[PDB]
């Protein structure tokens, strides 16, 4: 599924998503328009092995099981096929506990990149919430 950007606005807000541990949902919706085109089907393969998943791009590495990421953890306890579903709700759920690890919203490399700092407020502008 693409999602639309109010459409992805609501469904995040809908999860719990808006100010989840300071970040308002602009951020949210900023950080998956950047890492996945709104795309829940996303996949793409790191340089180590692990592959980023879904809506989101949640990485193998760490955060669930693809069975070929030697090594790797997953602390959401979930297959990373689980985050690539139309419905957003895995996704979300493993975002809020990599979100709550230390570092906040700069687990995200293109958030870090492309959204801290900026007018993020413009991602929600006209949305229905
Ligand atoms: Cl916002
Ligand atoms: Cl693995
Ligand atoms: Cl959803």
């Given at each position: ?76 306890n979930i297959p ?28 995200w490399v293109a ?13 929600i502008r006209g949305?229905?919430?």
């Amino acid at each position: 599924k693409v999602f639309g950007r109010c459409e992805l606005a609501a469904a995040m807000k809908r999860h719990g998503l808006d100010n989840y541990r300071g970040y308002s949902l602009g951020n949210w919706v900023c950080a998956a328009k950047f890492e996945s085109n709104f795309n829940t089907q996303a996949t793409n393969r790191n340089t180590d092995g692990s592959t980023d998943y879904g809506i989101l791009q949640i990485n193998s590495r760490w955060w669930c099981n693809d069975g070929r990421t030697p090594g790797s953890r997953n602390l959401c306890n979930i297959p990373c096929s689980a985050l690539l579903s139309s419905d957003i709700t895995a996704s979300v759920n493993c975002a809020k506990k990599i979100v709550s690890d230390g570092n906040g919203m700069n687990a995200w490399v293109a958030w870090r990149n492309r959204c801290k700092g900026t007018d993020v407020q413009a991602w929600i502008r006209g949305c229905r919430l």
